[PDB]
Amino acid sequence: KPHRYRPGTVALREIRRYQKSTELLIRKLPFQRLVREIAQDFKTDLRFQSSAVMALQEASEAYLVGLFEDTNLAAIHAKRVTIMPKDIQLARRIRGE
Amino acid sequence: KPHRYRPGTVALREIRRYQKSTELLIRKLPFQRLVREIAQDFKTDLRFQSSAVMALQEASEAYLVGLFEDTNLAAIHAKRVTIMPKDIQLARRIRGE
Amino acid sequence: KVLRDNIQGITKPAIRRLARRGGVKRISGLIYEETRGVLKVFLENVIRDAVTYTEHAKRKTVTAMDVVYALKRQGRTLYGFGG
Amino acid sequence: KVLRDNIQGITKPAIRRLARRGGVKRISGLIYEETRGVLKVFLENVIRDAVTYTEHAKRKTVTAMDVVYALKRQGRTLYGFGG
Amino acid sequence: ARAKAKTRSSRAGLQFPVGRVHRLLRKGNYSERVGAGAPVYLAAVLEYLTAEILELAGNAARDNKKTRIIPRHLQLAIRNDEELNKLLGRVTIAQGGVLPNIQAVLLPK
Amino acid sequence: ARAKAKTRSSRAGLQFPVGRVHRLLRKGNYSERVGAGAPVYLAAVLEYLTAEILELAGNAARDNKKTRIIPRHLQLAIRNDEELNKLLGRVTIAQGGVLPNIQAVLLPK
Amino acid sequence: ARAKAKTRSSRAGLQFPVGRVHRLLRKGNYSERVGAGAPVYLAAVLEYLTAEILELAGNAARDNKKTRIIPRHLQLAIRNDEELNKLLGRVTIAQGGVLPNIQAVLLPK
Amino acid sequence: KRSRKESYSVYVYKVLKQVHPDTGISSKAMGIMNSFVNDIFERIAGEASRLAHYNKRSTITSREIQTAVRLLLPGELAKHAVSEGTKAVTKYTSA
Amino acid sequence: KRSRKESYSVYVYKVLKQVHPDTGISSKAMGIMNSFVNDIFERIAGEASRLAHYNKRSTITSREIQTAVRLLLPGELAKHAVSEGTKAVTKYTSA
Amino acid sequence: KRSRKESYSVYVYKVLKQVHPDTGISSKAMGIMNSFVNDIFERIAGEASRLAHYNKRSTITSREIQTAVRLLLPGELAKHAVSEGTKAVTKYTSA
DNA sequence: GCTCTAGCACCGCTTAAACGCACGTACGCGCTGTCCCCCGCGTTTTAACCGCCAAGGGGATTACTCCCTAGTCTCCAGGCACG
């Protein structure tokens, strides 16, 4: 029998690894494609500094980890551990938008 | 038996009446004396006009009531109609204190 | 002159009426203590700021103008008192 | 030239890595498209501002300086590219 | 010997003050200099915003069958517009109370 | 016969400039006149904050047995400190990540 | 014809006297030469010591709500600190008494 | 002998009579309007000052406060304010 | 050569050489420190401007920044900051 | 006629008012601080003289007291004192 | 330094607020079943990353020259004080 870790153990190992980690968690070129796409929605043929793509990356992921920290608090509030769309809607409604 | 409503019906009447209401919810004199209590807690012989007491009043119901919309959104998130303190400090933590 | 414990002067039914404006149906008996505590915390912040404003102005009476300045600083801007 | 679908380019395991950075253990299957949506909406919120500075500057190229300015306007000030 | 004294707001055809807002910016220390169209534009923006909120205030007074505007009507007007709430979500109101907002599970049955 | 150009920061006994801070106060357009205590006081509070956070950064780096300061050490240093966290709640550090702050019930038993 | 007088304490930004300690090290007869940084170094050290202990004594005086420092406040201040206890284990304090120190077995029950 | 206090009294009253001639006004609502005008004026002024700082512009222009209107004022009221401001400066420079 | 992009470079290295002689500095951490000094200077300068307008003062001296430090920086850091700022202004008066 | 007896009067008063403006002094406490500063001074001075004998240097520099304060003063107290003296001597050499 | 005015201090009725007890009903939640749904791991694909090379759009700089804007003297007229 091949060895199999229990559900959640590899999840906690990912948690510990990625809290210890500091690197980017998004592939950079599809992110750049997406931000050029949404820039084209508002103004055509805009150009991006690669550092500007990195800044939008880090601000975006910081926003996401703040929202996910909020939804973890919402999930442990709801006697649960699986985060739900109602948790994300709650966190955004609390934060005032 | 005398006249008596089910629990919540008078509560709904209270909610409707004081969402309709525009007048002040808290007493004037103990609020002013509590302001004075905090004042001489910081610097003695501090005076207040009645308008300033009204201003701290308005700020108090604004802040507290806003915490109550945040709080009962938390409470309906937890599938409950009775609120508990953990809703209040979790809401204060999500607000970013 | 000096007072000790007027914080219960904001009575429990005042808090109930506040939560009725806040649309809370059921208010536990445990709730009123931390509402008084957070109200103490918020007023401690606001009156610290306001006292700092007035002591900057070399006065001895707090104006509502300094109160609405303190509400500008802390991010709870209030309308209607000459701000 | 024109791009239509790169919101799916932010892959689901990449969102999983982000949530592990957010400390999430268990993620529902309906979460990922919603995270795409809220990151999307946040990108309009940021980039309309950033494009607005860019068109104020009479420029065509997005710079990180305006990204910092847009993020600090919303009170989400970003260290690491200002100055 | 002199030109007739003419208000700049009526030159722009607005009621809101070109002069008072211009002087208040110049003494408000936001730059050293101000363009000529800047306080005209700002007065136009403020007059538009006040016109919208006073139109909704008159609508609220007519709904309450009252003639004079109350800050309750003003809070009712602001909270019933989504984009003004996006403008004034963190602003607290004097004697406005709360908008009528009862939640789905808060209502009975 | 002019006196030797001696620095105002050393007159403060400090390192953050009275000159640059006074210049960015004057050209930041915050008041018409600026008192002489203003830039020395504000440079002093920045030097206090800087010394405190690089103290915590150095201790964080030596805790991780590393020599050169990294924004991971900086972000760790900021959210060990309660009053720094209350100062910088809404600020995001580049490449800092998140300090390990793991809630207890999601940890295994 | 002469430079204006500046004390070395003002040059170092200290308010313990650099010259007094320099004299008292010359006439304390500890070496025939003394480096110039030595007395200002020592005065800064005593400045840190006295500032530390006057923080402690003023805080203790506020804790017993008395306005003026007393040797009882000083003796609480020294004896409630560990490193000052090692620094002054063999030191007698006039009218300072003893720190409140009851052993666990001396308590009833 | 008391001192004059600067307000927006008859100006808001005039635009009130333009939008609703038959209605009245209270003093508490007037405090609300005065603080509202002050707060929105301050928000626009602050964002205009920051925008002039960012693009090294030492003057406040109508273009950059129009930019500020796109920034602070959201959505459809933003383009209404753009229409109002451009119309206003049009009949202002034609005056 | 290019135009000088002004920063807080040598100051952060010398304050580190005061507080920790042996540790080194990365460029990312240095950018973080630059943006930190920018943010804190901007906050304190803006609140000083606010107190200037609020007390109808055209003058900003150390007293208004002492007011602002008591406002913004909480508690322990506030009184610490007031202490070394007072020492700094006293050595400024003693030159 | 009286002969003046030297003490550490104004220095302890000034440093107390720099750390606590609203806290007063009693004279017996003032004698305790006089004896404290004299005691610690003679401890450091005797240790410095012994070091000068010990390394056969005819001088006591800042480095001798730097050595002596990790000798007598403990740890964090000593390292804070070393930092205070280091910034003090850099200000002294700059003046 | 003056002054004058609303806050501070003190005074006297009035039931509304508070409060407290008691009946009553609803409230939260644990057990446990039950159903279900997403993580772990293996395998396969595929473009991300790397790394390598051409090209040109515009960011940024320098200069020019002119648009504009605060300031000031002065004058008058509508908003504020006052009723």
Three-state secondary-structure class, residue A40: helix
Q: What angle do CA D9, D13, D18 make, to 5 degrees?
A: 95
Could you tell me which residues come within 8 angstroms of residue A23 by beta carbon, excluding any fewer than 6 positions away?
A: none
How was it solved? cryo-EM
Report B:36-65 residues touching C (Cβ under 8 A): 36-40, 42-43, 45-49, 51-52, 54-56, 58-65
- Distance, in Å, from the CA atom of D40 to the CA atom of D44, rounded to the nearest integer, reads 7
Asked if G13 reaches chain I (Cβ–Cβ under 8 Å), the answer is: yes
* Phi, psi for E67 (deg, rounded to 5): -95, -35
The 3-state DSSP class for residue G95 equals coil
Half-sphere exposure of D9 (CA within 13 A, CB side): 18
Nearest CA in chain J to I90: J18
The identity of residue C24, as a single letter, is V
What is the resolution in angstroms? 5.1
**Testing the interface with A: which of B94, B95, B97 to mutate, by most A Cβ within 10 A?**
B94
Judged by phi (left if over 0) then psi (alpha if -120 to 50, else beta), residue B45 lies in left
Phi first, then psi, for residue H6 (nearest 5°) are -80, 135
- How far is the C-alpha of B26 from the C-alpha of B18, rounded, in Å? 12
DSSP E109: -
Q: Are C75 and E89 in contact (CB under 8 A)?
A: no
Contact pairs from chain C to chain H, CB under 8 Å: 20
Residues from D contacting I (CB-CB < 8 Å) are 68, 72, 77-83
Question: Distance from residue E22 (CA) to nucleotide K73 (C1'), in Å?
Answer: 20
Single-letter code of the amino acid located at H85: G
F28: which chain H residues are within 8 Å (Cβ-Cβ)?
A: 53
| Cross-chain CB nearest to F100 (options A19, A62, A65) | A19
HEC letters along chain F: CCCCCCCHHHHCCCCCCHHHHHHHHHCCCCCCEECCHHHHHHHHHHHHHHHHHHHHHHHHHHHCCCCEECHHHHHHHHCCCHHHHHHCCCCECCCCCCCCCCCCCCCCC
Sort out which chain F residues have CB atoms less than 8 A from B97's CB and list them. 86, 89
CA pair distance D5, A33, nearest whole angstrom: 9
The three-point CA angle B63-B68-B72 to 5° equals: 160
The answer, for J58 touching chain F at a CB cutoff of 8 Å, is: no
Q: Say whether E92 sits in a helix, a strand or coil.
A: strand
Q: What whole-number distance in Å separates Cα of residue F75 and Cα of residue F91?
A: 11
CA quadruple G37, G38, G39, G42: dihedral sign: positive
Q: Which residue type, as a one-letter code, is found at position J31?
A: G
Residue among E28, E41, E51 whose CB faces H88 most closely: E41
Handedness of CA I82, I84, I90, I95 (dihedral sign): negative
- Yes or no, beta carbons of C23 and E106 under 8 Å apart: yes
What is the rounded distance in angstroms from the CA atom of residue E86 to the CA atom of residue E101?
17
Tokens 């400039």 -> residue = F17
Element of type H or E holding D61: strand D61-62
Assigned token pair, I2: 């290019």
* Cα E29 from Cα E25, distance rounded (Å): 7
For residue F65, CA distances in Å to E28, E30, F62, J46 come to: 52, 48, 5, 38
Strands, E assignment, A1-97: 47-48, 82-83
Give the C-alpha separation, C68 to C76, whole Å: 9
Asked if chain H contacts chain A via 3 or more Cβ pairs within 8 Å, the reply is no
Q: H20, E43: Cβ pair inside 8 Å?
A: no
- Give the integer Cα–Cα distance in Å for B23 and E94: 10
Q: Which nucleotide is nearest to C13 (CA to C1')?
A: K18
Backbone angles phi, psi at J25, to 5 degrees: -130, 140
- Beta-carbon contacts of G39 under 8 Å, excluding residues fewer than 6 positions away, are G18, G19, G21, G22, G25
Alpha carbons J15 and E11: distance in angstroms, whole number: 66
Residue E36 sits at φ, ψ, to 5 deg, of -70, -35
- Dihedral (CA of E49, E53, E54, E55) sign: positive
Q: Could you write out the three-class secondary structure of I52-76?
A: HHHCCCCEECHHHHHHHHHHCCCCH
Residue F28 touches partner H, C-beta closer than 8 Å: yes
Hey, is the C-beta of A59 within 8 angstroms of any chain B C-beta? Answer: no
- Name the residue closest to the C1' of K68 by its CA: E35
Touching chains C and E? (3+ Cβ pairs < 8 A): yes
Query: Among all chains, which residue has been given the structure tokens 């008591």?
Result: I70
What type of residue sits at position J1?
Answer: K
Hey, CA dihedral for D67, D73, D77, D80, is it positive or negative?
positive
For chain J, which domains are there? 1-95 (1.10.20.10)
What tokens does G87 get?
């620094």
E-I Cβ pairs (cutoff 8 Å, strict): 4
CB-CB neighbors (< 8 A) of H49 in chain F: 29
Q: Which amino acid is at F40?
A: V
> Is H54 in Cβ contact with D53 (below 8 Å)?
yes
I22 is written with which tokens? Answer: 């042996």
* Residue of F69, F70, F76 to mutate, interface with I, max I Cβ within 10 Å: F69
E24 vs chain I: nearest CA distance in angstroms? 11
Quick count: other Cβ atoms within 10 Å of Cβ I74?
16
Q: How many residues does chain F have?
A: 109
The set of residues, in sequence order, having a beta carbon less than 8 Å from that of E23 and lying 6+ positions away, is: none
What distance in Å separates the CA atoms of residue E14 and residue E42, rounded to the nearest whole number? Answer: 11
Task: Point out the residue among J18, J19, J87 whose CB comes nearest to the CB of I18.
Answer: J87
Distance between CA atoms of residues J77 and J67, nearest Å: 14
Separation CA C21–CA F107 (nearest Å): 39
Direct distance between the N- and C-terminal alpha carbons of chain C, in angstroms, rounded to an integer: 32
Q: Is G17 helix (H, G, I), strand (E, B) or coil?
A: coil
Distance from CA of F27 to the nearest CA of E (A): 10
DSSP chain B: ----PPTTHHHHHHHHHHHH--S--S-SHHHHHHHHHHHHHHSSS-EE-HHHHHHHHHHHHHHHHHHHHHHHHHHHHTT-SEE-HHHHHHHHHHHT-
Q: Residue E70, Cα to own-chain centre: how many angstroms?
A: 15
Q: Report, at the CATH architecture level, how domain D1-83 is classified.
A: Orthogonal Bundle (1.10)
At E33, which helix (H) or strand (E)?
Answer: strand E33-34
Q: Any idea which nucleotide's C1' is nearest the CA of A27?
A: K48
Query: Which residue in this structure is represented by tokens 């507080």?
Result: I19
DSSP letter (8 states) at residue C61 = E
Phi, psi (5° rounding) for residue E98?
-125, 150
Q: Pick the closest to residue F103 from A15, A21, B74 (CA basis).
A: A15
Cα–Cα distance list, C14 to B64, C10, I54 (Å): 11, 6, 34
Give the H/E segment covering residue G65: none
CA–CA separation, H14 vs E17, rounded Å?
12
Tell me how far the alpha carbon of residue D82 is from its chain's centroid. 18
Chain E residues close to I52, C-beta within 8 Å: 29
Contacts of A10 (CB under 8 A, 6+ apart): none
- Report the nucleotide nearest the CA of residue I5, measured to C1': K60
Is residue A60 within 8 Å of residue D47, measured between CB atoms? no
Beta strand ranges found along chain G (DSSP E):
33-34, 68-69
- Residue B54 contacts residue C64 (beta carbons within 8 Å): yes
CA of A15 and C1' of K40: distance in angstroms? 15
Rounded CA–C1' distance between D9 and K47, in angstroms? 12
**Which residue of D23, D25, D80 is in closest CB contact with F94?**
D80
| Chain B closest-CA separation from residue A83 CA (Å) | 12
Calpha distance I11→G37 (Å, rounded)? 24
The pairs formed by D27-34 with CB atoms below 8 angstroms and a separation of 24 or more are D27/A82, D27/A83, D28/A82, D28/A83, D28/A84, D28/A85, D30/A84, D30/A85, D31/A83, D31/A84, D31/A85, D31/A88, D34/A85, D34/A88
Q: Could you identify the residue written with the tokens 């004294």? A: E5
Measured in angstroms, the CA of D57 and the nearest CA of chain F are apart by 20
The structure tokens listed for A20 are 């210890």
| Distance of E7 CA from K78 C1′ (whole Å) | 10
Q: How far apart are CA F61 and CA A68, in angstroms?
A: 28
How many Å from the CA of B32 to C1' of K9?
16
Task: Calculate Rg over the CA atoms of chain I.
Answer: 16
Is the distance from CB of F30 to CB of I52 less than 8 angstroms? yes
* Three-state SS letters, chain H: CCCCCCCCHHHHHHHHHHHCCCCEECHHHHHHHHHHHHHHHHHHHHHHHHHHHHCCCCEECHHHHHHHHHHHCCHHHHHHHHHHHHHHHHHHHCC
- For residue E68, the tally of other CB atoms under 10 A from its CB is 12
What is the signed CA dihedral for I44, I47, I48, I52, rounded to 10 degrees? 170
In angstroms, rounded to a whole number, what is the distance separating the alpha carbons of residues C69 and C54?
11
Q: Is F30 on the interface with E (CB under 8 A)?
A: yes
Contact C34, B85 (CB under 8 A): yes
8 Å CB contact between F72 and F95: yes
Tell the residue number behind the tokens 């006295």, with chain if given. Answer: G50
Q: Best of F25, F26, F27, F29 to disrupt the E interface by mutation (most E CBs within 10 Å)?
A: F29
Structure tokens at F23: 């210049």
- As given in the structure block, the two tokens for residue F20 are 């640059």
Spell out the residues 6+ positions from residue A28 whose beta carbon is closer than 8 angstroms to its own: A53, A54, A57
Residue D19's closest chain F neighbor by CA? F98
- Subunit contact D83:I7, Cβ cutoff 8 A: yes
The H helix count followed by the E strand count for chain I is 4, 2
Three-state secondary-structure class, residue I41: helix
- Interface touch D80/I32, C-beta < 8 Å: yes
In angstroms, the Cα distances linking H77 to B30, C17, E45, E51 are: 44, 36, 10, 12
B72 vs E106: CB contact, 8 Å cut-off? yes
CA–C1' D14–K36 (A):
25
